[PDB]
Design a protein around this ligand. Sequence first.
Ligand code: FMN
Ligand code: FMN
Lengths: 226, 211
Amino acid sequence: SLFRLDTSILGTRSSTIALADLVEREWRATAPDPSVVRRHLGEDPLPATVWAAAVAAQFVPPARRAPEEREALSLAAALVDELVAAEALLLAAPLYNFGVSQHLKTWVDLLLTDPRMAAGTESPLAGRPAVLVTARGGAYGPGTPREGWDHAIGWMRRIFGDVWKLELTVVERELTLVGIDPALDRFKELAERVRVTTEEQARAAGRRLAAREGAFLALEHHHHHH
Amino acid sequence: SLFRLDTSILGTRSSTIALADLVEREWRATAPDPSVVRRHLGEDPLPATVWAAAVAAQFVPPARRAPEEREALSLAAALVDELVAAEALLLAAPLYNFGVSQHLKTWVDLLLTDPRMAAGTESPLAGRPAVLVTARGGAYGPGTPREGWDHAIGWMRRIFGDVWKLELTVVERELTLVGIDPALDRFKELAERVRVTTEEQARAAGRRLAA
Ligand SMILES: Cc1cc2nc3c(=O)[nH]c(=O)nc-3n(C[C@H](O)[C@H](O)[C@H](O)COP(=O)(O)O)c2cc1C
Ligand SMILES: Cc1cc2nc3c(=O)[nH]c(=O)nc-3n(C[C@H](O)[C@H](O)[C@H](O)COP(=O)(O)O)c2cc1C
């Protein structure tokens, strides 16, 4: 099955929801399991109290735990349950105020309270494919005035890439505030070609996710010594 | 007055609360208008629904806004009020899961929905002194396997330094899990020696804040 996490708060005007939708159409089209499990933290955020309670329970004989502590670690397990149930991941995290979504950080903070996701434990997701959909208002690449101002990209890549050891495909649509903020009207055409191109890339990542089981069984080089 | 923010969820065991007191002690003791307004997002988190509500309200005509939409923009205005009202700032944010405190970003997200904090407007806090107390369980210095693995320090510096234009002094304690993680006993005395140093760095910051 595919697991889909949306974190956008802008509803129907969401670039990330729209790009993720194009990825999902491709999954359902070519995937052996077109099934999709979804969670929308943007509409249904995880409460801001449950993390602290889980961190406390984490080292307490389960019986000496308190109502909120237990309910907190139970919820952590349900969220891990969803990730370990999916053969592939679609995670849509837009750029807000130069950093991580409050909703994405919350979700990840609480996941990492579940024993199966602690530190030093082997990721139960290693090798599994993930498409990450981000968008930005302005342009953030090398040589722009906003180079190194996306403090989110690197964090999500360390968690999904280096910690969870997921196989990561990234779809970034920059210039989503072009036509919205006049100060970016020197970008009108660039912004358009960017959109069309990243729409294909979102279609592309969906096709590639769908076929990853096949592509792994067709893989022969396994670096045995010789 | 002094404005103090805590984000720690560790209570009695916080390295950042401990270090932040050292700054505040220097304030109250040797500072004029020595009053201290404080807010502990670790004990009293801002609701997780309030940022979206404030962002959405700005698209609904004012005359027809929903109480929850009006209520969120009021709360944003009150957190801005706190900051605009202080001569100095004391902001304590630990490193959590390689990234930013979930509560610090919510607070910053909802601050920036107020029209005084908005893009294109001048920082109403520009030039104001600010001490940032942060702590790490590991060592994230140049030359270490964990270099570039603190994705928080850069982001807080962008908001507080580059957007808010505060004259920002950072006090940072590392190796806060030496003694808790058995695999760090190779640092028992170094760990202790960074503690006493950052404590004195914390007292230093206080004095110059009070000056
Ligand atoms: C509260 C808020 C903060 C934003 N912060 C940034 C920012 O720091 N940098 C940026 O390039 N765009 C920023 N944007 C613009 C968004 O990145 C853009 O609207 C993007 O499409 C958001 O994804 P979504 O539409 O799927 O929610 C922000 C938008 C909002 C509503
Ligand atoms: C949920 C959680 C996540 C943490 N993640 C990290 C981390 O990614 N890197 C690190 O060096 N320390 C990490 N630590 C340890 C903290 O850096 C250390 O405990 C610090 O002193 C916390 O600040 P506080 O005591 O003021 O809350 C983490 C601690 C907790 C409770």
